[PDB]
Task: structure prediction
Amino acid sequence: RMIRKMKLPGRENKTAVVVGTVTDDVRVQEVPKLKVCALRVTSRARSRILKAGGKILTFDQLALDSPKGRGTVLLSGPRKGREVYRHFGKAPGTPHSHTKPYVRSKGRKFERARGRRASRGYKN
Amino acid sequence: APSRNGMILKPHFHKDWQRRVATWFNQPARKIRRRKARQARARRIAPRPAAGPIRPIVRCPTVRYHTKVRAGRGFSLEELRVAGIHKKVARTIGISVDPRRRNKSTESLQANVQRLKEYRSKLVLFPRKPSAPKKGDSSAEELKLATQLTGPVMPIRNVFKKEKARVITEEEKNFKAFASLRMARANARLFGIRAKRAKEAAEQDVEKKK
Amino acid sequence: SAHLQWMVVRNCSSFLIKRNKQTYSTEPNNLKARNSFRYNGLIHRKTVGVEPAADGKGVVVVMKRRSGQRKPATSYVRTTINKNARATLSSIRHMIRKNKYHPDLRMAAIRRASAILRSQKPVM
Amino acid sequence: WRKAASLKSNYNLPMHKMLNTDLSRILKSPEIQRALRAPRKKIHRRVLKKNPL
Amino acid sequence: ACARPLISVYSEKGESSGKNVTLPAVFKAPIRPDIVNFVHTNLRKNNRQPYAV
Amino acid sequence: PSRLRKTRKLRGHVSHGHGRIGKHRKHPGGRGNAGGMHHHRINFDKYHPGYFGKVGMRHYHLKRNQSFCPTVNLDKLWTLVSEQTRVNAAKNKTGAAPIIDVVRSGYYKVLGKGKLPKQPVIVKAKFFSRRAEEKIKGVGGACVLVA
RNA sequence: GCCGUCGCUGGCAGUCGGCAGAGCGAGAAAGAGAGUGGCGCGGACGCUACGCCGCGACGAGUAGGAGGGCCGCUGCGGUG
RNA sequence: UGGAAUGCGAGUGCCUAGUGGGCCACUUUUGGUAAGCAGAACUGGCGCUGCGGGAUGAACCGAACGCCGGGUUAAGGCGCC
RNA sequence: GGGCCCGGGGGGCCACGCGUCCCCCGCGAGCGCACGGGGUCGGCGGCGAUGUCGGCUACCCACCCGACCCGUCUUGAAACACGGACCAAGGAGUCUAACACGUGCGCGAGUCGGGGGCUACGAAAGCCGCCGUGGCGCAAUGAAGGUGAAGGCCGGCGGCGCGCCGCCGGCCGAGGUGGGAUCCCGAGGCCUUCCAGUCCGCCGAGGGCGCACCACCGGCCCGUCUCGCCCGCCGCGCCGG
RNA sequence: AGGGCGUGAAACCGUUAAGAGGUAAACGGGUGGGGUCCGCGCAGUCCGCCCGGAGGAUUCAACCCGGCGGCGCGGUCCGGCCGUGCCGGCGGGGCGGAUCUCCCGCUCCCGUCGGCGGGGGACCGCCCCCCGGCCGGCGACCGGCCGCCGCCGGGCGCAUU
RNA sequence: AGACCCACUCCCCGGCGCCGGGGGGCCCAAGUCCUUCUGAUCGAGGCCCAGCCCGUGGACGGUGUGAGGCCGGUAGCGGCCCCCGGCGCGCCGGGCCCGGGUCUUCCCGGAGUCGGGUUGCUUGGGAAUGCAGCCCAAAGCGGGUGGUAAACUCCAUCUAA
Ligand SMILES: [Mg+2]
Ligand SMILES: [Mg+2]
Ligand SMILES: [Mg+2]
Ligand SMILES: [Mg+2]
Ligand SMILES: [Mg+2]
Ligand SMILES: [Mg+2]
Ligand SMILES: [Mg+2]
Ligand SMILES: [Mg+2]
Ligand SMILES: [Mg+2]
Ligand SMILES: [Mg+2]
Ligand SMILES: [Mg+2]
Ligand SMILES: [Mg+2]
Ligand SMILES: [Mg+2]
Ligand SMILES: [Mg+2]
Ligand SMILES: [Mg+2]
Ligand SMILES: [Mg+2]
Ligand SMILES: [Mg+2]
Ligand SMILES: [Mg+2]
Ligand SMILES: [Mg+2]
Ligand SMILES: [Mg+2]
Ligand SMILES: [Mg+2]
Ligand SMILES: [Mg+2]
Ligand SMILES: [Mg+2]
Ligand SMILES: [Mg+2]
Ligand SMILES: [Mg+2]
Ligand SMILES: [Mg+2]
Ligand SMILES: [Mg+2]
Ligand SMILES: [Mg+2]
Ligand SMILES: [Mg+2]
Ligand SMILES: [Mg+2]
Ligand SMILES: [Mg+2]
Ligand SMILES: [Mg+2]
Ligand SMILES: [Mg+2]
Ligand SMILES: [Mg+2]
Ligand SMILES: [Mg+2]
Ligand SMILES: [Mg+2]
Ligand SMILES: [Mg+2]
Ligand SMILES: [Mg+2]
Ligand SMILES: [Mg+2]
Result:
């Protein structure tokens, strides 16, 4: 995601600033050179970025490089990525509420009988 | 009463469970008891392997695990007969023997024969009478350089054959795998009824003759 | 670094003393004895101390040399000034200003080297 | 941080969330000092309101 | 930081011997008192013995 | 830590955080999941829909290892081999194609989700998906089966 | 007048000192910028930044909630 | 020319206690001879709320509360208490 | 009355320069006074060592106003509602399992040795990776058998009758619209005698790439339905796609 | 501490002292009266500068010697040390690799001939250690001479300091 | 079991007798050193340049507060002495007269039990998981199991009473 957000036209030779961590993404094969500044960079993303030839700054190094933050690209990972945000919204068992319920296990006989079958009772 | 949103959780605490509570405060006091009796045993059997008799190489059942290899219970009497070791004398040189094992394949029977050869060759035997050597007995030069082997004897390690990079032929690129799976699955789900429908095609079209 | 080990010493030191809504500090070379980043006598690279001379009269001045920093034995230099009340308060002043040595501590050093002279006169 | 632990199985010293921890030298550095507005260090306490009448 | 000095082994007579050892990299790892405390106040709950009426 | 809990600020208030009008009685709704069909129906229908009834066929002696089949997607297929196997086929010129054995890594089925890098492969696997096999032909490569 | 809460997501690392020049309250987006040609050795306080300082507005409360306690009780690891 | 006026920073997300006996008043209002009765509507109160007045007072009139000095009021008052 | 009370011939002006072109006919120094960014006096006087000075609080007493006994259930309690003679000590949201959310920490598509093993405090701590079995996460969907997550343009061939269908070999490649912190370009400009004149900075009309997120529309996987036309071959089929 | 005897609270009681007393007592706000002790009250703060007034030192500045410390764009002085630096090499070495390939176990077919159980060897990456090059740091990590400055000690100063 | 072959003398117990863990008993360092507090010190200060002495002993308890050095103890692959047992080697009197491989001929199994019906209990075991009562009551290329009752036919798997 930092690749495709730094490949957008125009923002070349800029430093990708993050406030969280820069995890690896094993399902990407080519890595360009990137100037990056984050709080953490996992020990398998330091490898890829440095073998590519990019720099990995810190927030103090960034504050010395560009105090006013000129030449940067603020980013932030997906916030609704957490599995928590799938139970939020309209409660389940409600017309057009694709919200995930809290169930011990998922299977044939765990909340599949009445409020889901048009046969047994109804469905929403 | 249930709250707004949560699980329907069933706690299995409707029996007098406080009576039958098992606490593990003696877990460190039994790890030392086991380790102590494990070195009293590794001192009672002085040069014999500390882990005990050698165990065979054994595939596992249950397609979940039928690609790993394991250490069985004993060497089947077939593998002992092939290796030439009497089933009642094997147990006295630290070879494990269980009679219950069969041997349907051969690639494993020869693996366990090669295993017995690799053990009956590393075996340092001490003479029954100390002050007098015997015929089938390692010479006195070994016995002084005979130590107690720690850990399992001839440990079993899952290996994988390294296959080098080939070049793909036009018979390999021609192979539609998914169609072959859906076809073999159909030709197996339908084999019985096809054979019966053809027994009927052959039981009717004969009546026309007589 | 100074700000780093100050963020470790600011509350869980052994010289820190907290009672009666006040918070002083008992560091060796802390002058004004109060718990602060500026006056702490152990955190910085260059500190100043003004102790009383071991005998009756005089004031010792304890500068912390730059070269020896992880060598506590050969780190501090000490100079006993057993002079009148004014020359010693022009020698501490020169020691700090003309050397440009931690210059925000000068009036604190004079104010302490005067408390010592005052606490060494014959009582009444 | 470049040579792993030999006696442990796979362990490298934890990385640093900031390298130059001396924010005194950082703050009075020409890189940052130039990119600042002049300090507004004047105290403007409440002006008593007299009566224009 | 990155500069690892050269500590000097001290003979048993107090005087410094000739031997030197380069400061191991562990002595530059981050000082995290919160992690140290959280680990201490949990690891020393382990040497505790049960007690109950 | 009791000294951090909420019963240390609740000393001196009569009802201890639980109500003056409606007391904190023992079980004013029944125990457990009681009244799933009678007086807790709005909750068992607003939050656990489908909790009551039967559906489907039973299977008496189910053994969870006859149906063992862990899958791996094409996107992370190239992560099973080392890195000097994917780049050695880049620098390669004799067209040789590395053999990726999947059941050796611990997956049986190969599903095709991600993109692939343009180089040939020989994927040995137990089960293949239609698209997982088409994305491999379309890049040039063979889908070996292994029983 | 004083205490407190809230807001200003306010101000202060500029204690930049004979390697000196002491400013950012003023109605009007932006430099007390560079270069290129026509004696007396002196100067309060501060800054536990989880700190300090300035401005306004506000201040009832059962059931209930939250925070802050350098309020208190008994033992444990450190430290005085 | 941000297409009436006036005012004011808004939007959104989780987790959530207590409650699910109410009562009074102006006005409208149903049953009843009526009731400090039973029952509705709107707003404001009491409950959860002191203070000045109504001698007294859950609910009326004024007015809502950090601790204090000066000044002025509300509603009520000014023979004496 | 308004127009600087348009124009001609005794009192008040926050008006008082010379040199033109022209329509209307950038630094003067001092010196004080003060209705001026919240109080000072560079004004005083009395008493003070065995009977007097100060001490708001705290002990007793006096007087004026106020003032019903607390906990409780209650629409409502000082109640002719209940508990309470007095004092001391003890006395009530605890621990375990599960779940959910929030939060701090380590690692991060991985993660965790909890079980096992190896080496006074120590029953601790350390270590194992060919001890990661296994749990949870990385894939869902169907009752199941089971299936299981972008495509487009290009030629060349066969078919229908210029498009499409299938068929081989190319290159392009993981949607879009609206809002969107942040960042980027910059017409013009930021004074000191006067113009050109470069570097450094900063502001800025307008124009851009657009984080997260939100709305909407497309796309993809499984189940199901409807309408269909084609392709596959060891088994040509109540087959498979 | 006097045989249920460490400390010996509260309610309750006795006696002594002080005050008080017809709207039960107690209570909040406000003062006044009296007591109890405290301030160890009762001639009332000190501090810097300067001016004068009387005295006493073995005393100031400035020089000389020795030590110590700071700073040094000593534009760029000598020699070190490190770099979560960067390139080179008729270099040595260790870890890892799902990158490749002479001897050996044992195997099928007559010591010939093919499969595989095992260490070399080649290779790639990292790391470590010697080689040269620069780069840049020594402010988490310096040593000598040189310069300026400060300070201390010892002299020299005879006193309008 | 017969024949062909090869291989081949410790194995066990009982003592007699001597050879290197457990219990019990006893003991093993060093200040009561000077001044000074107290009712009493185990307190306070001192003990040079052997930094008072010991320390593999600074756990603890007692002793007129508070003790490494007063006492018992603590540490020690420290010692000394008793008893038990093990592990050992000889010797006696006994045992035991012994094995494997290839052919050939032979032999081989557990009943009122399994099993079916039915009833009662139990189990997650659902057209009966297990157990038990009553009735019926076996077979021997048979029997049981193969988690849906039944027939047919295949295979897998053990060998109940
Ligand atoms: Mg509730
Ligand atoms: Mg409350
Ligand atoms: Mg209650
Ligand atoms: Mg509550
Ligand atoms: Mg309730
Ligand atoms: Mg409850
Ligand atoms: Mg009902
Ligand atoms: Mg309030
Ligand atoms: Mg109720
Ligand atoms: Mg009513
Ligand atoms: Mg109520
Ligand atoms: Mg209210
Ligand atoms: Mg009210
Ligand atoms: Mg009245
Ligand atoms: Mg008033
Ligand atoms: Mg009146
Ligand atoms: Mg009254
Ligand atoms: Mg009650
Ligand atoms: Mg009532
Ligand atoms: Mg009454
Ligand atoms: Mg009652
Ligand atoms: Mg009573
Ligand atoms: Mg109590
Ligand atoms: Mg909840
Ligand atoms: Mg969490
Ligand atoms: Mg006593
Ligand atoms: Mg006693
Ligand atoms: Mg007593
Ligand atoms: Mg009396
Ligand atoms: Mg004692
Ligand atoms: Mg002593
Ligand atoms: Mg003792
Ligand atoms: Mg002693
Ligand atoms: Mg002794
Ligand atoms: Mg002893
Ligand atoms: Mg001992
Ligand atoms: Mg029963
Ligand atoms: Mg039951
Ligand atoms: Mg069958």
